[PDB]
Amino acid sequence: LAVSLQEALQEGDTRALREVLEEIHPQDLLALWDELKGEHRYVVLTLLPKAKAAEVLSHLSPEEQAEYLKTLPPWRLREILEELSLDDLADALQAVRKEDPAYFQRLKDLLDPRTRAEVEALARYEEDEAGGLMTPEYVAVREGMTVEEVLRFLRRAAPDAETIYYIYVVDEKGRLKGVLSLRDLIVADPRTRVAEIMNPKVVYVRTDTDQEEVARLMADYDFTVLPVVDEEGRLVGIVTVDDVLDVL
Amino acid sequence: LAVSLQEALQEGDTRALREVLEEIHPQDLLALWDELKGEHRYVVLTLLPKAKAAEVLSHLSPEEQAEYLKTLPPWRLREILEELSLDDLADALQAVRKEDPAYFQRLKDLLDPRTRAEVEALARYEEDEAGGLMTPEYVAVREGMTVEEVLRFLRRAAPDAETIYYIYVVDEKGRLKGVLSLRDLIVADPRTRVAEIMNPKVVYVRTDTDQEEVARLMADYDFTVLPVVDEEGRLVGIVTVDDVLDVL
Numbered sequence A, B: 001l002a003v004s005l006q007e008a009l010q011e012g013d014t015r016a017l018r019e020v021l022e023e024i025h026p027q028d029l030l031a032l033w034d035e036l037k038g039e040h041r042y043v044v045l046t047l048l049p050k051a052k053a054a055e056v057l058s059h060l061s062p063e064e065q066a067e068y069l070k071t072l073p074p075w076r077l078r079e080i081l082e083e084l085s086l087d088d089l090a091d092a093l094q095a096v097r098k099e100d101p102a103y104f105q106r107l108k109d110l111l112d113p114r115t116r117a118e119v120e121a122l123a124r125y126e127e128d129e130a131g132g133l134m135t136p137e138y139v140a141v142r143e144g145m146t147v148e149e150v151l152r153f154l155r156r157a158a159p160d161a162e163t164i165y166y167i168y169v170v171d172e173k174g175r176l177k178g179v180l181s182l183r184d185l186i187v188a189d190p191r192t193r194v195a196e197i198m199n200p201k202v203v204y205v206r207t208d209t210d211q212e213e214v215a216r217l218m219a220d221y222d223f224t225v226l227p228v229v230d231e232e233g234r235l236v237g238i239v240t241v242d243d244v245l246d247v248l
Ligand SMILES: [Mg+2]
Pocket: A087, A090, A091, A127, A131, A132, A133, A134
């Protein structure tokens, strides 16, 4: 699928192109990416199935990110943007914002209202602090819920969640009460309460906490996921280790 | 629980000491660790519940690791060592080996035969290559197994596994056929075959692959777990991202 693409490209074989794009793995494409003329990068980001396109763009430089969000057709932008994880959308928007703040406003208007309001709260936080790294696509439950109710829930929430391997616990006010893992859930009795299984001394970070600290905290405790709260102690999101590895 | 310890320490209050150690979190202890006299580091590694002691020692420098494996009583060493994850045991043994190869042989003899043979294959690989980072404590299944059989299996394997969030697939010969996630398993129908759910294009690494490459591969694909094979394409272990974060 590697060069077997530049075959469809140099040729102008749309049929063959679309076919290779249906199964080309995002990383396989991100590889030979420096070896693609400008015209070809544009066509691929156009014809690629939207989810993969979002994936690719999410891994490009922010200057490249901003250039394609400014040159790709609005119908296509609509598609790519709605496929981005929230934290990746914010970074992609902030990329454009830096260059053209007016078009940033346009990009946000192309979003679905539910999506648009979410990024807005996000895109604001300092981009080198917990808020600028986190995503609100986590799973939270109450401590009164049983394991059976949570597992049932997770199957429903899985498709959109950043992860379901770490499940946070909150109260009526939305404040962090503890942490739970999919592993514990899987071995526990379906009748067991979540409070009888959670770890009440969950370690967390603030929305303004420096990214150095988030990285250090995640390396020390060996977490793959860390919760992020606001000034009122309420769960507002999670940071995952893949995004910490990138901060280096 | 922080300084509330140095209280039992400076006093010589074994009862109080053991009590604080029953609930002192490993990282909470690893913190005020530079602020502990030699005598106190020794007592804590002695009285701490074995699992936590293994945890603490696993995070100390390799020179400190080797000094305590040479000064702690054999009955206690027996306990700590059997609580270490395999990859951590190998590194702890290699630490001592560098200083005193003879005592390394003693340390290995204190292990349980099943444990001893396992570390031996491990402790040999280059410690800056996949082999020197991996652990054989992963979960593998066949592609003919159903989801129900795998979930049943995982509950049984959970307690010792490094993780059960990524389940590898092998054949009769033990060679890597694909990868699967706990997430997919949870949403899939219990009757579904594993081959109808796995990703056949699993990305993997060799036992001799450089650790730079393991880190890069894990950062690019955003994996939290990567499989490691030998020269015959057989699954011999996994590397987890927490150990890659440490390689920096
Ligand atoms: Mg961001």
